[PDB]
A paper describes a structure:
As reported for other α-amylases from mammals, insect, plants, fungi, archaea and bacterial α-amylases, the enzyme consists of three distinct domains, A (residues 1 to 97 and 160 to 379), B (residues 98 to 159) and C (residues 380 to 476). In DMA, the nucleophile is Asp186, the general acid/base catalyst Glu223 and the transition state stabilizer is Asp288.
The three-dimensional structure of DMA in complex with the well-known α-glucosidase inhibitor acarbose was solved to 2.0 Å resolution. For the DMA-acarbose complex, careful inspection of the electron density maps in the active site region revealed a well-defined heptasaccharide occupying subsites −4 to +3 resulting from a transglycosylation reaction as seen for the psychrophilic AHA and the human salivary α-amylase, HSA. Hereby, the pseudo-tetrasaccharide which is synthesized by Actinoplanes sp. and which is composed of an acarviosin linked to maltose, is transformed to a heptasaccharide consisting of an acarviosin-glucose linked to an acarbose. In addition to this structural calcium ion, a second metal ion, which is located between the catalytic domain A and domain C, was revealed in the DMA crystal structures described herein.
Author numbering: 1 to 476
Write the structure that this text describes.
């Protein structure tokens, strides 16, 4: 429940938010695999309610557990999981079993229907007996209300009923049979850990035909928003699996926006209120808070603030704490709008420019060189500890990961032009933020490390990027 089941030498779980299964399978073979990424978090794979204008959040209103969505059907999903596993990229499913669709959700994405007004969902065989008595959540200081009442009108399932446990376990086991590596448990805060323990403990072992070692169990990351001041703490879940560490997203946004100083990053980790490193999924933003949903912090950094977004992403990917998840978005100016479509309904596949960047309504942050090259950085440094920490007491910092990678940041309003200790072997390195190693040369900036380990590091405050990174797997 705690091991990611990543393949060897890989890091980074990309949330391919609202992507179709066929497009993910291609992306695994064309990009994610060859660029050392470790996994893909998919949108909910089960049938959801069809809502007017097809908002993104319609997928969090389950109608059945049949694998029929705007992303594809079961055959397309199964083929994607196989094709992704074959190139070393794992699949993690956003599973939604706190609730069923709310009132108005009559039609499902796979042809099923439902009567949420009567709590009747004939696709899951669900009836009103399978739900908690109707009430609304308002007081997050009442743990009983948070877990037993309806979240924004979504019909609240009773996971204490053995029939509901059976239906959920059957659904998750089915996904395991198809080769998934783990699950992102939606609204875990709104369910009782005792019931989740029963569901988690019943899941079968992972499918060894997809390359998982014998005895492997599903990775469990639980969506628990714990900013403090409420009745439910993330510590109620860290014994059953990992948790979504939203303090990381909030703090890293404040720090790299300039609301806090980079010099304080010297004790990044539990000293900032985070859960344990081996229990924390970290991210710069997620599909909720990039949109003002969920925690909804205005200091969250998104692709819309690109320079500081890449700096925070680079710091996350360079830092040993936690398990990083890399957001991948579609462009939006409305917090309800769904993914791009060809006709208002059919999701439009991403298209690619001459430089392999995304277009057609998709951002593909995972295809930004400053981000995927930092995945390569993370892969090169392994488990090496932070060394050679330096800062100017404000917003200029640098450090190495052992003797294998070095990173430097400038968030001050003046230039950084300093000889810094990199801890790396002497030689000529390609800055992987501004470019890549290509043959025996660099496409962007070059960094020369002398015999004493020091190098001239130059990051102008007005440059497009405010981070520089070098590592031994991009050395001339
Ligand atoms: Cl999440
Ligand atoms: Sr509940
Ligand atoms: Sr200091």
């Amino acid at each position: 429940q705690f091991d990611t089941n990543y393949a060897s030498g890989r890091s980074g779980m990309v949330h391919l938010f609202e992507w179709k299964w066929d497009d993910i399978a291609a992306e695994c073979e064309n990009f994610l695999g060859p660029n050392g990424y470790a996994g893909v978090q998919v949108s909910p794979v089960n049938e959801n309610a069809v809502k007017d204008s097809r908002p993104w959040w319609e997928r969090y209103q389950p109608i059945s557990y049949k694998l029929e969505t705007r992303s594809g059907n079961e055959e397309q999903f199964a083929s994607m999981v196989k094709r992704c596993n074959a190139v070393g990229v794992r699949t993690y499913v956003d599973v939604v079993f706190n609730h069923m669709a709310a009132d108005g959700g009559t039609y499902g994405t796979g042809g099923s229907t439902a009567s949420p007004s009567s709590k009747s969902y004939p696709g899951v065989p669900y009836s009103s007996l399978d739900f908690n008595p109707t009430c609304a959540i308002s007081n997050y200081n009442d743990a009983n209300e948070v877990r037993n009442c309806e979240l924004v009108g979504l019909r609240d399932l009773n996971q204490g009923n053995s029939y509901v446990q059976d239906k959920v376990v059957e659904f998750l086991d089915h996904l395991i049979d198809l080769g998934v590596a783990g699950f992102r448990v939606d609204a875990a805060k709104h369910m009782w850990p005792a019931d989740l323990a029963v569901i988690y403990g019943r899941l079968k072992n992972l499918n060894t035909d997809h390359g998982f070692a014998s005895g492997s169990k599903a990775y469990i990351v639980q969506e628990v928003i714990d900013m403090g001041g409420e009745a439910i703490s993330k510590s109620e879940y860290t014994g059953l699996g990992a948790i979504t560490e939203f303090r990381h997203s909030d703090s890293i946004g404040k720090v790299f926006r300039g609301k806090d100083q980079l010099q304080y990053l010297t004790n990044w980790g539990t000293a900032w209120g985070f859960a344990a490193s081996d229990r924390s999924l970290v991210f710069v933003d997620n599909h909720d808070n990039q949109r003002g949903h969920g925690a909804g912090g205005a200091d969250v950094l998104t692709y819309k603030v690109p320079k500081q977004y890449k700096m925070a992403s680079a710091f996350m990917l360079a830092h040993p704490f936690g398990t990083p998840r890399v957001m991948s978005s579609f462009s939006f100016t409305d917090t309800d709008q769904g993914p791009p479509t060809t006709d208002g309904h059919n999701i439009a596949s991403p298209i690619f420019n001459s430089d392999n960047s995304c277009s057609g309504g998709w951002v593909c942050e995972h295809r930004w060189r400053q981000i995927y090259n930092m995945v390569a950085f993370r892969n090169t440094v392994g488990s090496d500890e932070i060394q050679n920490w330096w800062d100017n007491g404000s917003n200029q910092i640098s450090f190495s990961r052992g003797s294998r990678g070095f990173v430097a940041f400038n968030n001050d309003n003046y230039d950084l032009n300093s000889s810094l200790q990199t801890g790396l072997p002497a030689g000529t390195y390609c800055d992987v933020i501004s470019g890549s190693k290509s043959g025996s040369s660099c496409t962007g900036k070059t960094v020369t490390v002398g015999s004493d380990g020091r190098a001239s590091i130059n990051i102008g405050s007005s440059e497009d990027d405010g981070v520089l990174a070098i590592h031994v797997n991009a050395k001339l």
